[PDB]
Amino acid sequence: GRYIGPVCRLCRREGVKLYLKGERCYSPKCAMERRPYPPGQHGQKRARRPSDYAVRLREKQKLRRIYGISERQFRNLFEEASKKKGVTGSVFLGLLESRLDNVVYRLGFAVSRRQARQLVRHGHITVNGRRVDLPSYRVRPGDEIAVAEKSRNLELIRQNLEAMKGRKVGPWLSLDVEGMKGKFLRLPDREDLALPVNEQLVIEFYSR
Amino acid sequence: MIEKLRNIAIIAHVDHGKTTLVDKLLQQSGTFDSRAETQERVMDSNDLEKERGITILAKNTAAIKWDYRINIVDTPGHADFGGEVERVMSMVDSVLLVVDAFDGPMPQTRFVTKKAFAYGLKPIVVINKVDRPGARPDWVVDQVFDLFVNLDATDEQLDFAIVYASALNGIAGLDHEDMAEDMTPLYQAIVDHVPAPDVDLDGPFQMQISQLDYNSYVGVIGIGRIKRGKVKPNQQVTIIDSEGKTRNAKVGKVLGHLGLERIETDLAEAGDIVAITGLGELNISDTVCDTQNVEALPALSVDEPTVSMFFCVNTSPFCGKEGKFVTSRQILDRLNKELVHNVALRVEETEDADAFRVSGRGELHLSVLIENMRREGFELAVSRPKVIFREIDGRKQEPYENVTLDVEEQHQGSVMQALGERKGDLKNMNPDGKGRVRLDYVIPSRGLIGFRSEFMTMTSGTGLLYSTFSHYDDVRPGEVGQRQNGVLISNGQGKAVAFALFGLQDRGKLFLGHGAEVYEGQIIGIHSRSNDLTVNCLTGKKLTNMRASGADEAVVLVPPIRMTLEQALEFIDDDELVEVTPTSIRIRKRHLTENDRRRANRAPK
Amino acid sequence: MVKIRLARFGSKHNPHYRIVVTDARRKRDGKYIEKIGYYDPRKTTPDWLKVDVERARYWLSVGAQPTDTARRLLRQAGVFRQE
Amino acid sequence: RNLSALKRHRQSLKRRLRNKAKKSAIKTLSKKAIQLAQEGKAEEALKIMRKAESLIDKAAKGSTLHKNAAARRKSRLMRKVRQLLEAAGAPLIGGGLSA
Amino acid sequence: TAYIPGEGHNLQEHSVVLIRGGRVKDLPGVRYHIVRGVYDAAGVKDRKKSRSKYGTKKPKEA
RNA sequence: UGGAGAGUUUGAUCCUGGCUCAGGGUGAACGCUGGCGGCGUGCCUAAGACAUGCAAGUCGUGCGGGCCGCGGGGUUUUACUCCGUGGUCAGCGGCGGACGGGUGAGUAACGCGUGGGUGACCUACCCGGAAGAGGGGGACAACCCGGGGAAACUCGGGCUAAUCCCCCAUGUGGACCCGCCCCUUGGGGUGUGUCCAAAGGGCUUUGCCCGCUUCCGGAUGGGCCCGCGUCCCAUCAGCUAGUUGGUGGGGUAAUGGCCCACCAAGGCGACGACGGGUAGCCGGUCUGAGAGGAUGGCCGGCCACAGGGGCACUGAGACACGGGCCCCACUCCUACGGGAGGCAGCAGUUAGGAAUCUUCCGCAAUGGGCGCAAGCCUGACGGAGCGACGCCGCUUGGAGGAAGAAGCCCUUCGGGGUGUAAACUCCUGAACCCGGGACGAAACCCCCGACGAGGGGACUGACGGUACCGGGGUAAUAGCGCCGGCCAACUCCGUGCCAGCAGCC
Ligand SMILES: Nc1nc2c(ncn2[C@@H]2O[C@H](COP(=O)(O)OP(=O)(O)CP(=O)(O)O)[C@@H](O)[C@H]2O)c(=O)[nH]1
Known part of the structure; x- marks a missing residue:
């Protein structure tokens, strides 16, 4: 299914308040609050480098994520913006x-x-x-x-x-x-x- | 419609008129000519004619007419696999014991009627062969009267029934002295003597597919007696032990030799629905019928016979070889495939990935499966799954369980010898005033093998006794055989040389011939003593000339001595896997190489 | 015979039909001597039918025989009102 | 294992019988003709040319001669009647072959 | 020749199974290999992680 | 409106090049998981072999008949004909069996795509025009008799119908020779001669309708021909007797060496000829920024075979899947003499393999063949089942609930971790329950009015009582790969060149 599971766990994951649970992962508790850092057994492990990949993938990723809708489909519409003249960047954002x-x-x-x-x-x-x-x-x-x-x-x-x-x-x-x-x-x-x-x-x- | 079905079985044994019973009666059943045997039944039934029963239907009247059925075993043996007929008590309402007026009955039959003695189903005596001369018919009747006087019936007594039959279709009967002909009274001696098995005039379908088979098209065949409801899916169904099931297709009853999907089922008869559920799979244990409401249905009922022949893979040197199925994989596929139809078979898993404990019924039973294996193209050795000496510090702590086999004080000294000679400690010989006397000899799995065979040759069938174990021992200190007259082994692969087998020929007997080119470990005769050796020859040497001539000499040589299987298997003792093939049967020692055998022996201490 | 009949276009449970001409040989869907109007009985579109009246006629000319249901469809169309 | 259609066959039997028969016919008589012309019996040769013409077409009728079957048939025919009858002998009953 | 992967094993001459093929450098001629469970050949008993390859259904953690 | 590069050959450096890798795609299989549905989707190896059950007949408005029922006698009855008729079964007589269904072996070819070609053609079931339709004869089945055979089938005798066959009239024509004028390779008028037309049936019937013959014609479908385009190997060089052409000649719907006799002998080739290997061509499809790669089933189109090999008649149309003759292998039967079989059609079997379903309901929709229509035929189709085999949609849950459990993971034992994650409250509310229930279908037919135009009436859907809508109604499956670099993801332990993992390094 459209993902499921400890998601304010993601609050911590990406950072940019994945308060996104709706309310309290939104007020005083959920990475957005509390141990704001990247969760995990080593979340408080001084990070390392960001492969230009780490980069693109990261953004692409939390992006898709915060919307609760298939990666596949996502990319799909993307294409649409892509094969439907106009900064697909935008077109898509919109479609999103x-x-x-x-x-x-x-x-x-x-x-x-x-x-x-x-x-x-x-x-x-x-x-x-x-x-x-x-x-x-x-x-x-x-x-x-x-x-x-x-x-x-x-x-x-x-x-x-x-x-x-x-x-x-x-x-x-x-x-x-x-x-x-x-x-x-x-x-x-x-x-x-x-x-x-x-x-x-x-x-x-x-x-x- | 179910108050007219009459399914019975025609017990038998080593002799003498199997079916015979089921067949011949055709009059009745069939068109004209020819054959009229087979009879009927089945496939490769030349040398013998046992196993593979079913069924005896045909809408033959007599007339009389009807009863009906005329739809029961019908089953000889010579069983092989010890019981099998068991699937008969789960439908048949009477037995048709066909004894001989020449000598009477045979021990072989002292089971088909016994296993059901505690019944339940007034047997139906049937004296045949009476058409000949030497064969008192009045005396036989008296003997067949004591078969119950000591076991009861109880309403048998009757046991009437009480026929004699005749070659030229008498049959008597009835009994004496010419029936008719003989195709008008036998029918009456059944119907008027056969009742309508309590069937559910209504309710759901209660058909217990006792047996089961399959056809290169007609899918799987149900096979069983309907207890309630019938009968035209689908209209799914229900199986025993498990769900059972989705639905069904058709159903080919037993109109005589089909095949023909019963236009409408109900009960009583021995119908065998099909199509549903695609015959996937089959287990004469469940109780198919309507959709629940509600389980369950009996019985199991019994199959655990005895005997055990370890199985393995001809991982020898001779390649490669028999046909296309010698490895383990191919073999396994066969094993499980047998654990379906067979009812008296008990396949067990041992230690050696190439070994199996084939637990059958009778000593000959295991043969049927072995003989059929070759014709199929699959060489295998026998038995041969040994035991484990534990546990463990130690000296063989296996079990020990004995059982007398009356007796008839005509074997008290013929059975006490083997047991006592093989450590067979008679923990106790419970005697009685009758005439027989039990004899429980705590024997182990080491001194039990082959015993079943020779045993049947001592008491002559009339002698049953199993065992199990009383406590893991240590094998004691003596060997439980170990067989006399050592086995002659080879010294390498090649071929039989007249000049090679000529020399040491009076040192016992020979197996192969010439140019017969066997290999190492393979036995080629028995030694005049108990010791074992590994001669050799091809060579046969040596040629030739000149000079010169002309005299003389021209040694010959005798041939087998060959066979049987069946006559060579039981010949082993330690580790002589009877390597068999779909066209040959060899026998070698667990260790081909001579020097290799000494490695494992190595004795004390 | 040279006929105007239909073909099925749509998918699973959806059949509009091709109002077309071909020789009663090419599968109901075979190529077609030619295309001529389209119609759908389940309805949907307010425009559930366009049976080119003209072609109807022209074609019709020399022997053009139509499915019966065909003929009724075309007349309805109004290619058959002898005014 | 049964299918009426065999009819077909049987018919082939009938029909084919006939048709051949006839085809034979025209062939043979056309020939005979060719001959008369040959010998020089102009007149009669023509008469043949006739009975000929006739039967050729008779064929025309059904499926023995067709399209231009009978056509070549005749063309051949008359051209020949003439050629043969062209050893200086007069188109006697020049019926079948116009002026 | 091909590789007999999978930690534990068996299969004697007369043992079927199969090859999903797979070169295996470090022992020339091993241009292919088997695959645990193929007909005969079973699977890496008492195994845990990554099991499809080295085939072995998941364990009911009991 | 659209092209990203990483690894990798030194002691470290720069280069050529080899190879590795990423992503993308498939009528995949296998491992491991499997909850709903939708639609596309389903032998790509034994193109081997197949039990079995359907896969094409339909017309008495075509014709004689036999069997059957009704009514009706007849004749006293005796008898058993004859009628009328519902019909049934063949026989016969027509129109479909040449698409519809299959597959790709074979095929390097105008076979195919493509664009043209035909003074060398032909299309019955439809529309167009003109002319015709008037006498005479007769067959073999059906039946009965007779006979051989097990069967298959079947050989001999005897009578009968028709829209069957045959003769004679009538030609608007047509065909041929020959004749001419116009053309232009066998196209057009016409002149002299010759040869050829042709069945009825039924009804409100003296005519209304199915139909019949001759020819010019249309739409149509096809046939032969011709350009260019249509795969690797030249360690395949030299290839050619109907073979290059010519005379005439036979065949065919007509060409043509397509087959023939004669006659002259040229004809072909690196602008790759002869040979060998591969092969259903394409429209189209995945692929790639891209020219270009590959591929070309399920649609659709053109092409070829039907166990393999050969042939020919029936004919408007075949050399003809479910038609017919002959040989090879196959397989089955028998009274051994002798007969029957081809599922590369639908479903279905066994063998093969990594492998691929269902022996379903329905002709209600479309569609097709006979029907004057009534309707009859119709595993084309319309669905239906089953397969993660693919593609699309959907779900096992939402929301608040601790400096924060239990527990297990790490621990410099201070603490850190998995985790709001779960527990809890409210909640929503899949599966599942009750009620209703679809288009899908409107035609062929009734009645009007010239049976025509138009118009009003009549009838009929297996998907389904599901789809759908309504009201009900519990919170309800997750996993699989990876985690040294390429690449994104870290620690404990075991482990310690045994065991092992690898695409590369
Ligand atoms: N003259 C005569 N011969 C008989 C009679 N019954 C059987 N036989 C002969 O004896 C043999 C044995 O009879 P059969 O019934 O075939 O043996 P079976 O009982 O079916 C096989 P099994 O003895 O193992 O159970 C047969 O071959 C048959 O020819 C009989 O009544 N009269």
């Missing part, structure tokens, strides 16, 4: 995002990429028209979705749609905490995506 699942989280609805994907498969999705559960299903030229029917009612629905009702999203994500509904605009673009990384690093890494 535009994924349903990706979005499931992206819009506060979800608090972690994982719970996000989860819900996605589990229903409570409001595709433009009733719904879809493919924590994959891209997000066509910015569409609408949200706490589907019989969903606007689950305790966690609450936790979320509820504690939520506040903050704003990005320049490509339309947050309507109202009738719990999110709507996409257009290709997110470099800038509007915090999440530090680069691109080149990773694509070259691929080059063959």
Whole structure:
């Protein structure tokens, strides 16, 4: 499956807060906090050299990782950006995002990429028209979705749609905490995506 | 429909009219001519005609008519493999003991009826050969009446049944003095005397595929008696011991010699569904039937006979060789393949990767498997799995278990000799007022081998006794044979030379001939004494001339002395693996090279 | 015979058909004397059929015989309204 | 192990019988003809040329002569009637062969 | 000739098994080799890590 | 809109070159794991051999018949014909068996791709036009009789139908010779002569419909031909008698040495000829930044064989998979004389090997063959099963829960580690349960109206009661390779040139 296991263990692994578990691996405890260093039996072992490889692979890697979606598929879309004119670096970055699942989280609805994907498969999705559960299903030229029917009612629905009702999203994500509904605009673009990384690093890494 | 099935078996033995019973009755069963034997049954049944039973169906009337079935063993032996017929008590509702009016019954038959004596199934006496002259029929009836008077039946008594039969199809019967003909009363002496095995007029399918086989197309054959439900998958099924199972295909009953998938099964009869589950695999132990609801079904029931012939690989020098299967791999494939059909066979794993403890039933039983191995193309030695001297400081701590074999005080002095001569300590000879008398001789696995053979030659079949162990000993201090008249071994590979085998020829007997070119370790006759030697010759030397002539001399030489197997195997004692082949049978010592033998002996101390 | 019949295009459980012409010899899918309109009975597209009326006719001209279901499809099309 | 179709065969029997028979026919008579022309019996040679022409086509009818079968047949025929009958002898009943 | 890998073994003349082939420098002519479990030849008993090659299913850690 | 380099031959240096390695791809196998599904997907070796069960028939609007049922007598009954008819079974008479299904042995070739060619052609089941359809005869099966054989089959006699065969009219034509004019290698009109046309059937019937003959024609499908392009070895040099061509000549739908007689003898070759080795060509496909490598099954197209070898008739069309004659090997049967078999078709067997499924349901959809239609035939197809054999999607879980367990790992024993990892709370909610349930299909047919246009009616899906939707509903599988450098990933112990690992170093 889409990986599983002690992941704030990864919090430690890569560093750049893999708080990513969603909340506390996000506040006072998870490499992002606590022994911030690379975990392991030798995590506190003064590192060594970074093969230009260590480099590219590293970036490519945590990158893919923090999104909970197949390495294969990943590379796939990549290609797409590659075989679909336009700095594939960008195009892809975008594609990365535009994924349903990706979005499931992206819009506060979800608090972690994982719970996000989860819900996605589990229903409570409001595709433009009733719904879809493919924590994959891209997000066509910015569409609408949200706490589907019989969903606007689950305790966690609450936790979320509820504690939520506040903050704003990005320049490509339309947050309507109202009738719990999110709507996409257009290709997110470099800038509007915090999440530090680069691109080149990773694509070259691929080059063959 | 199940209240008309009548499946019975026609016990037998060393003689005299196997089937005979099953066959001939055709009248009845068949078109016209010819053959009418075989009969029936089976494949390579020339020299003899045992093993490979099944089944005796045919919708033959008589008329009478029907009963029905007419669908039971039907099984001789001369068993080989000791029991086998066991799969008969798991269906048959009566036995057809076919004795001879010339001498009566044979010890060989003193089992087929015994193993089921504690029944259960009123045997059906059948005196044959009465068509001849010398063969009192009234006297035989009296003798066959004491077979129970001392063992009970109890309702036998009857034991009536009580037939004589006749060559020209009498058969009597009934009994005396010409039946008809004889193809109109025998039927009555069965039906009217045969009941309808308690079958479940309804419920699920309870067919216990006792036996089982396979065909180069007709897949695997079920083979067994239906206990409940029947019968047209699929409609999966269920197996015993394990799940059993997915589903099923068809089912070829026993209409006489097929093959033909029973249009509709139910019970009583001895149907054998197929197709489901592809005959994968087969174990006359489970109890196929409906989908659970619910296990289980009996019985096992019994197969553990005795005997043991260690197996190995002809890792000798002569190459290479028999056909294409001499290594271990090829052999193994055969071993397991036998642990399927065989019911009286017990394959065991020893120490030597090239050794096996083939535990069969009778001394001859193991032969059937060996004889069939050659014709298939696979040379192997016999037995020959020895024991281990432990444990361990030490001197052979094996076990010791003896058992009398009545007796009939006509062997009390013929059996006490061997045992007493082989250390066979008679821990106790439980006697009785009847006439026989048990004799438990704590014998070890070292003094038990081959014993089964000679034993059957002492009491003449009428003598059974097994063992096991009482406590690991140390072998004592004496050798348990070790056989008399040392075995003549060779001194190298080459060929038999008249001038070589001529010299030392009066020093006993010879095996091979000429130019017979054997090798080292291979035996070529027995010594006039107990000592062993390793002569040689080819050479036969020497040629030639001139000069000159003309006289004289022209030594000849006698030939085997050859055989049997069967007549050479039991000849061993220490380590003379009877290397057999799909067209030949040799016998060499565990150590070919002479000087090599001394390495292991090496005696004290 | 020279006929206008269809072929199946799609996959597993999906069969649109090629409204085409060929000689009743080349497998329902064999090459085809020529392509002419397409149609799908499961529906989906609002555009579940395009049976070129003209070609229908022209071809039709000399002997063009059509599957029966063919003929009905084309007439429907409106290549068969004798007005 | 049974299949009606054999019919075919049997027919071949019938048909083939016939057709040959005829083919023979035209062959042989055409020949005979060729001969008359040869000897010089112009007149009769022609008559033949006739019965000929006739049967050739009769063949035409079915599957014995075909396409241009009968064609060459005739062409050959008449050209010959003439050539043969060209030892100075007059196209007597020059019917079958026009002016 | 080919290499008999796998720590422990057996197989006498009359022993099948097989070669997945594999040169094995340090002993010329070993242009191929066997593969534990092939028909006859069993597997590296009492083994633990890396086992597909030197074939041996995983142990129920019991 | 797209090309990354590392190892490796010294005491260290620079170079040529050899070899090693990375990644990419496959109708793979094997090791080890195996939860759902979807779709592509499935002998690439014995192209050996195969039990068995389906794989092509369909028409009484074609024809006589036999057997069967109904109704109806007939005749008193005797009898058993004859009718009407539902039919059944062949026989006969037509139209399909030449695609549809298989595989690639053979094949170095216009066989193939490609582009042209045909004054040397031919296509029945359809549309186009014009003309025709009027007398006479007759067969062999069916049946009965007769006979040989085990069978196979079967030889001799006797009568009968037809859209079968044959003769005679009528030619709009057509064919041929020959004749001419126009052309232009055997294309077009026509003139004198000769030869050839042709079946009915059924009904609301005097005509409505299936159909029939002659010819010009269309769409169509194919045939022969021709350019260029289509693999290695020259330690394969010299190759050639129908062989180079010519006269005429026979065959064929027509060419042509395709087969013949004569006659002249040239004809071929390094712009590689003769030979040998390899081989189904391609459209296309993996590959590579790239020209270029390789490959070319499952689609699709053209090509060849059908156990191997040969042939020919039936014919619009074959030398013909499930057709026929003859030899080789094979295999089976017998009364030994004598007969039957070819699954490189669907499923399926055994042998081979590393190896490759199912002896399924369904003709409801498409599709194809006979049918005036009703419909009949249809392991083409439509699915269906089974295989990690590939490709796509999906899951065994989310979330909060300690300076932080137990425990095992390291430990300079201070501590460090695996680890929020697990335990816990809420949670969601796969598998699995109840209810409903699909397009997929609308045509051929009813009724209207010229049976036509158009129109309204009628009927029918094995995938499935699954798919799907709804409500239900527990939290539910992980592993496999690597860890000296190339390369990313570190420590304890054993171990101590035994054991061993290696692509290289
Ligand atoms: N005259 C005569 N001969 C007989 C009769 N029964 C058997 N035989 C002969 O004796 C021989 C033995 O009979 P058979 O039944 O074949 O032996 P079996 O019992 O089947 C084999 P086994 O004795 O091992 O059980 C046969 O070859 C047969 O010819 C009989 O009733 N009359």
